[PDB]
Design an enzyme around this catalytic site. Structure first.
Site, PDB file in Angstrom:
ATOM      1  N   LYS A   1      -1.436 -13.943   0.580  1.00  0.00           N
ATOM      2  CA  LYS A   1      -1.929 -14.295  -0.802  1.00  0.00           C
ATOM      3  C   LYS A   1      -1.218 -14.610  -1.896  1.00  0.00           C
ATOM      4  CE  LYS A   1      -5.923 -10.941   0.076  1.00  0.00           C
ATOM      5  NZ  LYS A   1      -6.247  -9.499   0.034  1.00  0.00           N
TER       6      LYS A   1
ATOM      7  N   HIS B   1       4.300  -6.102   6.377  1.00  0.00           N
ATOM      8  CA  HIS B   1       3.535  -5.867   5.311  1.00  0.00           C
ATOM      9  C   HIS B   1       2.115  -6.377   5.881  1.00  0.00           C
ATOM     10  CE1 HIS B   1       1.575  -7.163   1.452  1.00  0.00           C
ATOM     11  NE2 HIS B   1       1.392  -8.591   1.948  1.00  0.00           N
ATOM     12  N   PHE B   2       1.003  -5.713   5.306  1.00  0.00           N
ATOM     13  CA  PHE B   2      -0.368  -6.058   5.814  1.00  0.00           C
ATOM     14  C   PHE B   2      -1.011  -6.748   4.516  1.00  0.00           C
ATOM     15  CE2 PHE B   2      -4.066  -5.263   8.281  1.00  0.00           C
ATOM     16  CZ  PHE B   2      -4.961  -5.712   7.570  1.00  0.00           C
ATOM     17  N   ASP B   3      -1.250  -7.963   4.788  1.00  0.00           N
ATOM     18  CA  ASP B   3      -1.874  -8.753   3.543  1.00  0.00           C
ATOM     19  C   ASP B   3      -3.093  -8.977   3.331  1.00  0.00           C
ATOM     20  OD1 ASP B   3      -0.357 -10.542   1.648  1.00  0.00           O
ATOM     21  OD2 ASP B   3      -1.673 -12.222   2.453  1.00  0.00           O
TER      22      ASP B   3
ATOM     23  N   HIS C   1       0.089   1.767   8.443  1.00  0.00           N
ATOM     24  CA  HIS C   1      -0.859   0.757   8.700  1.00  0.00           C
ATOM     25  C   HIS C   1      -1.268   0.874  10.323  1.00  0.00           C
ATOM     26  CE1 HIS C   1      -0.940  -1.213   5.182  1.00  0.00           C
ATOM     27  NE2 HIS C   1       0.337  -1.399   5.313  1.00  0.00           N
TER      28      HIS C   1
ATOM     29  N   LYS D   1      -2.490   5.970  -3.472  1.00  0.00           N
ATOM     30  CA  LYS D   1      -2.440   4.656  -3.190  1.00  0.00           C
ATOM     31  C   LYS D   1      -3.806   4.186  -3.318  1.00  0.00           C
ATOM     32  CE  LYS D   1      -0.570   1.280  -0.153  1.00  0.00           C
ATOM     33  NZ  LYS D   1      -0.315   0.902   1.667  1.00  0.00           N
ATOM     34  N   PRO D   2      -4.084   2.997  -4.000  1.00  0.00           N
ATOM     35  CA  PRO D   2      -5.652   2.934  -4.273  1.00  0.00           C
ATOM     36  C   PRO D   2      -6.399   2.057  -2.914  1.00  0.00           C
ATOM     37  CG  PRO D   2      -4.279   1.234  -5.414  1.00  0.00           C
ATOM     38  CD  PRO D   2      -3.237   2.269  -4.848  1.00  0.00           C
ATOM     39  N   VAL D   3      -5.709   1.270  -2.154  1.00  0.00           N
ATOM     40  CA  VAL D   3      -6.164   1.002  -0.943  1.00  0.00           C
ATOM     41  C   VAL D   3      -5.149   0.756   0.237  1.00  0.00           C
ATOM     42  CG1 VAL D   3      -7.365  -1.306  -0.268  1.00  0.00           C
ATOM     43  CG2 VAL D   3      -7.349  -0.831  -2.650  1.00  0.00           C
TER      44      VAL D   3
ATOM     45  N   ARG E   1     -10.444   2.899   0.418  1.00  0.00           N
ATOM     46  CA  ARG E   1     -10.495   2.608  -0.835  1.00  0.00           C
ATOM     47  C   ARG E   1     -10.697   3.822  -1.801  1.00  0.00           C
ATOM     48  NH1 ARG E   1     -12.466  -1.139   0.025  1.00  0.00           N
ATOM     49  NH2 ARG E   1     -10.567  -2.636  -0.203  1.00  0.00           N
TER      50      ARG E   1
ATOM     51  N   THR F   1      -5.152  -0.183   4.755  1.00  0.00           N
ATOM     52  CA  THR F   1      -5.815  -0.642   6.068  1.00  0.00           C
ATOM     53  C   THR F   1      -4.985   0.119   7.173  1.00  0.00           C
ATOM     54  OG1 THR F   1      -6.778  -2.429   4.883  1.00  0.00           O
ATOM     55  CG2 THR F   1      -6.735  -2.406   7.327  1.00  0.00           C
TER      56      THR F   1
END
Length: 124
Positions: free
Chosen positions: A66, A119-121, A12, A41-43, A85, A45
């Site tokens: 989330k 973790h990036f939420d 990240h 990996k689909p997404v 993405r 940031t």
């Protein structure tokens, strides 16, 4: 094994650029950070800030993640981020991404001592 904190940096952080500069940024970065090794990996940031400014978010606004956990924190300031993405032509091992540059608040989950992002939420 790689620590959660180190994995967060790898997945990240990009303090070396201020913003994505071309539509190929995500294709390059997803590959170079080894996020496409086993599967696309689909997404993902990337955050274009100093590591210190991102670590500091663990002392800012406590919010629910989330998934309901309560070790998440929202940044007071907006940050430069790039959203990656997967596109419709993506096919392992040739994973392909759309690059979107934005300025948003980030939400991370924090753990440990020192208390750091793991973790990036979300971005909001």
């Amino acid at each position: 094994k790689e620590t959660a904190a180190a994995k967060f940096e790898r997945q990240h952080m990009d303090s070396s650029t201020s913003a994505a500069s071309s539509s190929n940024y995500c294709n390059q970065m997803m590959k170079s950070r080894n996020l496409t090794k086993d599967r696309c990996k689909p997404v993902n940031t990337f955050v274009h800030e100093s590591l210190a400014d991102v670590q500091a978010v663990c002392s800012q606004k406590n919010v629910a993640c989330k998934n309901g956990q309560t070790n998440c924190y929202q940044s007071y300031s907006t940050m430069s981020i790039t959203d990656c993405r997967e596109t419709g032509s993506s096919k392992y091992p040739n994973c392909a991404y759309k690059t979107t540059q934005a300025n948003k608040h980030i939400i991370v989950a924090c753990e440990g001592n020192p208390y750091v992002p793991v973790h990036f939420d979300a971005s909001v």
